[PDB]
Amino acid sequence: GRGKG
Amino acid sequence: GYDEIEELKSKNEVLTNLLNKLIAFDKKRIFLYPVNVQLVPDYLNVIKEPMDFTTMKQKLQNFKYKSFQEFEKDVLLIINNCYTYNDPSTIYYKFAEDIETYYKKLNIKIQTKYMNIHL
Ligand SMILES: [Cl-]
Ligand SMILES: [Cl-]
């Protein structure tokens, strides 16, 4: 995944 | 018949109390609603079965859970989705670990209280 924060 | 819907209702009450404890433990509401695809556009390209507590409340009101195991599958789906998408350095990954710890502390007694409805 790319990431949230 | 009456006896069967009564059983299903009393079992749902046990599953609901457990989901409410999981929602309460999730103070930041990380898992309450589906992950927002407008904030995380690649989320669903990685997560093939998104799950969240509000979806579980809808399955409950529709009496979709017919065994404790079907409920547990969804709790552990939320947790393992969080481990799959997020890097282990993030607050998300730590919160999943924390709710997995909380869930594992509760499920034995709740699972027994569920089987005891149809004892
Ligand atoms: Cl929290
Ligand atoms: Cl973070």
Q: Where are the domains of chain B?
A: 1-119
Which residue is associated with the tokens 């995944």? A1
> What residue type is assigned to position B91 of the chain?
I
Fold topology of B1-119: Histone Acetyltransferase; Chain A (1.20.920)
> Between chains, do A2 and B86 touch, taking CB under 8 Å as contact?
no
Question: Does the beta-carbon distance from A2 to B92 stay under 8 Å?
Answer: no
CB atoms < 10 A from the CB of B91, how many? Answer: 12
The resolution in Å comes to 2.0
Asked whether B85 and B47 are in contact (CB, 8 A), the reply is yes
Residue B38 burial (10 A CB sphere; 0-12, 13-18, 19+): exposed
Q: Tell me the one-letter amino acid at B112.
A: T
How was it solved?
X-ray
B89 Cα distance to chain centroid? 23
